[PDB]
């Protein structure tokens, strides 16, 4: 894609694909133990989706069921700017700063349940094990990210109830308008855990690519339901500014 124009990739689903380190090398981005490295165009391409089914029993294992994405090639975070900060103890810290760092995704589970979730890396701070002097195959950033509500506080449900907008009651039923717990919308801030395992480094250009595994809650519909647990696996790419 490095030499492809917009007119060559449009309508082809190559805009939603992560860039790939071509030069197959096992390089190493050397690091001073007390500095900061900017990450310019971070991309995470999700490839696998898993939703924790909630069995009706309370001692059965939940298990993770694969889903099919109902949305199309709109599942990728890209053009993300981050920093790699090095602790005095060789700890590498990934700190995603901004970018196209979220994508709403809807998966279908077997049995006909639609599970949308706010796929994101917002405010991700991942740390490796202390003792690194280079970014290599062993680097694995593990940390928490914020998962904001899938629907904003400006969202309106089909009966025009919302959080800072819309009705606060069931207007279609004047006598029973304050019966429905769904009259109160909330948008609680969720948390995800992401791991970035780096597998390929191109030290001649500062590029890093790897695989990720995310764990995050799904949409709750302004609190209308308990969120499911979603597992996302895929590949990522980044460039480190030296």
């Amino acid at each position: 894609k490095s030499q492809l124009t917009y007119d060559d990739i449009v309508n082809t689903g190559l805009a939603n694909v992560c860039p790939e380190i071509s030069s197959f090398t096992r390089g190493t981005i050397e690091v001073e133990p007390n500095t900061k490295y900017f990450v310019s165009d971070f991309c995470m391409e999700p490839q696998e989706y898993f939703v924790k089914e909630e069995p009706v029993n309370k001692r059965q294992k939940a298990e993770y069921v694969k889903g099919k994405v109902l949305t199309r090639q709109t599942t990728s975070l890209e053009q993300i700017r981050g920093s790699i900060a090095v602790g005095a103890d060789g700890t590498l810290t990934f700190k995603e700063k901004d970018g196209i760092d979220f994508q709403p995704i809807t998966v279908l589970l077997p049995g006909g349940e639609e599970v949308p979730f706010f796929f994101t890396v917002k405010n991700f701070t991942g740390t490796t094990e202390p003792g690194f002097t280079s970014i290599n195959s062993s680097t694995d950033f593990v940390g928490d990210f914020n998962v904001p509500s899938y629907r904003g506080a400006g969202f309106l449900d089909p009966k025009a109830r919302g959080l800072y907008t819309g009705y606060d009651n069931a207007v279609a039923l004047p006598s029973a308008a304050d019966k429905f717990r769904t009259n109160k919308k909330e948008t609680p801030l969720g948390k995800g855990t992401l791991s970035l395992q780096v597998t390929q480094v191109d030290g001649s250009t500062g590029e890093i690519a790897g695989i990720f595994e995310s764990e995050q809650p799904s949409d709750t519909d302004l609190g209308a339901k308990e969120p499911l647990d979603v597992k996302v696996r895929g590949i990522f790419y980044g460039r480190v500014d030296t």
């Binding site: 805009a15 970018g99 904003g152 969202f155």
Partner: protein, 450 residues
């Protein structure tokens, strides 16, 4: 030639049908009508000039003919600003004067000259059933039509050029030096799907392709004219077609309906042959300009336009198209195939580029987006611009709206005319256009359906 119902069988409201086999008077009707067309061109152009305010943009003044002249590169300079009104005036006057010559010739042939040309000349006399001569007429006209296309080519290449809205350093008149002769591109255009993202021939987006197309069109039309003069219709065509004046009229009506629908779509969607600096923004452009305008405002107020999720969960300013391209958010997601010379600088290989959207915006781009957004081709029939719920103080209806609506309506009514004359030509060839014969009604000799 009979000029009454008892002598022709045609009533006054079908009077021009009395000219079907009166080739001289029919020729007169045709030349006088051509005169009407040229008269309107000249007179309407002179009206537009007399009503033209040179500094005010063309699409704000109800102009549809001066934009056509300006696209050809006469009377305008960079960004379409008017340099001289005289070329528009000259175009109008030359059409207006020629109109009189055609009016005279028409009134002559319609009133004074021979009613039938068959006797007078073998060259101009035609019988509808004489396939060789009718193909001769097709050929002579195909050679003049191809000559006209080559006239467009000559104007774009050797006589000052044409307006290229995509020109580097801003839109301007450009002389085309490398027109696209590659038949793969040119005819590939014909093979593109007529849906979003491809747009068939409506998606032609560079003057080099337009000019190379007109070299092909001139060449194919001239070749087809020569072929039709030196050949006769073959057997399969002699067997599948109706050979009569009304039949040929219906064929041309079908063709005209097709071209009218095509022209409607062309003016609505394409901003290359119809530059927005003359025709105003396309509706796709106005929507994208709105999204862009508030992208810039909110970014300047300090918002993160990349990571700002909207109330639905999709990005408020930026999102991904179903194929992943970075596009503008909101309902404008539908117009993400829109290409415009003020937008394309901010597009990267993956779509809209965050680095460009955060550092390379220009005041002319912001001004252009504001102007295009406030000139969205939305307006009322009495020319109250903007959305229909707005109050009466903005006098504007886009030229694109006028042209598209007009040519869709004309295309539809000409499809209706095609059906009217094609069915009538078929019935009249078969001999039951005047009704069912009582003695030999076909259904009386057909078995019952049950």
């Amino acid at each position: 030639g009979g000029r009454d119902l008892p002598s022709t069988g045609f009533a006054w409201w079908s009077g021009n049908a009395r000219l079907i086999n009166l080739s001289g008077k029919l020729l007169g009707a045709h030349v006088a009508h051509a005169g009407l067309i040229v008269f309107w061109a000249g007179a309407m152009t002179l009206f537009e000039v007399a009503h033209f305010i040179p500094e005010k943009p063309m699409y704000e003044q109800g102009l549809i003919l001066l934009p056509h002249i300006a696209t050809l590169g006469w009377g305008v300079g960079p960004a379409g600003e008017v340099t001289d009104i005289f070329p528009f005036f000259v175009v109008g006057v030359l059409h207006l004067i020629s109109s009189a010559v055609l009016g005279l010739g028409g009134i002559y042939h319609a009133l004074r000259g021979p009613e039938v040309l068959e006797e007078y000349s073998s060259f101009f006399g035609y019988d509808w059933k004489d396939k060789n001569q009718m193909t001769n007429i097709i050929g002579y006209h195909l050679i003049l039509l191809g000559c006209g296309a080559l006239l467009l080519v000559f104007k774009a290449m050797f006589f000052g050029g044409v307006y290229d809205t995509w020109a580097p350093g801003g839109g301007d008149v450009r002389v085309i030096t490398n027109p696209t002769l590659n038949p793969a591109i040119i005819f590939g255009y014909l093979l593109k799907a007529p849906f979003g993202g491809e747009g068939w021939i409506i998606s032609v987006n560079n003057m080099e392709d337009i000019i190379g197309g007109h070299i092909w069109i001139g060449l194919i039309c001239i070749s087809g004219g020569i072929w039709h003069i030196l050949t006769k219709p073959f057997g399969w065509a002699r067997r599948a077609l109706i050979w009569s004046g009304e039949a040929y009229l219906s064929y041309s009506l079908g063709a005209l309906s097709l071209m009218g629908f095509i022209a409607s779509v062309f003016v609505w969607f394409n901003n290359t042959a119809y530059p927005s600096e003359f025709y105003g923004p396309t509706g796709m452009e106005a929507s994208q300009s709105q999204a862009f305008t508030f992208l810039v405002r909110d970014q300047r107020l300090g918002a993160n336009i990349a990571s700002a999720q909207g109330p639905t969960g999709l990005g408020k300013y930026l999102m991904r198209s179903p194929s992943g391209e970075i596009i503008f958010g909101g309902e404008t997601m539908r117009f993400w195939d829109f290409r415009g010379p003020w937008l394309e600088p901010l597009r990267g290989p993956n779509g809209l580029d965050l680095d460009k959207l955060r550092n390379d915006i220009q005041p002319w781009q912001v001004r252009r987006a504001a102007e295009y957004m406030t000139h969205a081709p939305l307006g009322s029939l009495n020319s109250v611009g903007g959305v229909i719920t707005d109050v009466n103080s903005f006098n504007y209806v886009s030229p694109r709206a006028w042209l598209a609506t007009s040519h869709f309506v004309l295309g539809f009514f000409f499809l209706v005319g095609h059906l009217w004359h094609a069915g009538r030509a078929r019935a009249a060839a078969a001999g039951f256009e005047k009704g069912i014969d009582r003695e030999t009604e076909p259904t009386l000799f057909m078995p019952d359906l049950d």
